[PDB]
Design a protein around this ligand. Sequence first.
Ligand SMILES: COc1ccc(Br)cc1S(=O)(=O)Nc1cccc(N2CCCC2=O)c1
Length: 127
Amino acid sequence: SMNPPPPETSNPNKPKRQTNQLQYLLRVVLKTLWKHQFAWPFQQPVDAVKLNLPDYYKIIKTPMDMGTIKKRLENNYYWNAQECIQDFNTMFTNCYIYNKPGDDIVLMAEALEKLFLQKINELPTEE
Ligand SMILES: COc1ccc(Br)cc1S(=O)(=O)Nc1cccc(N2CCCC2=O)c1
């Protein structure tokens, strides 16, 4: 009960589109970060029970993780690339809010974010 319902990965009344940029976000950006040695804490919603983080969802009220983003991309949840990019940024931002600079989890987020930005820098112009 300490864990909230996970963020939705489908929403039938939400509008969505498929674009070459969203395809790139799944095939390149998500794939790259997913396979990284530092991906594992971010591959699923924070489990405040398993990880003994009872304060986590008192502090982080807009949770996000790459497991959710992966399913959202696979399920064509997004209207555009910016919506997806926002989810990645929410995930990083949450980490920096909850944890202390220089913590192991923050070092991992920072490495992933660096890679993220490198991949985003090559995002193709739309169509
Ligand atoms: C002592 O616990 C750890 C130490 C270092 C690492 Br790396 C991971 C863990 S953990 O995954 O067992 N627990 C843990 C603790 C604090 C923050 C986060 N997370 C996960 C993603 C977002 C976020 O804030 C998880």
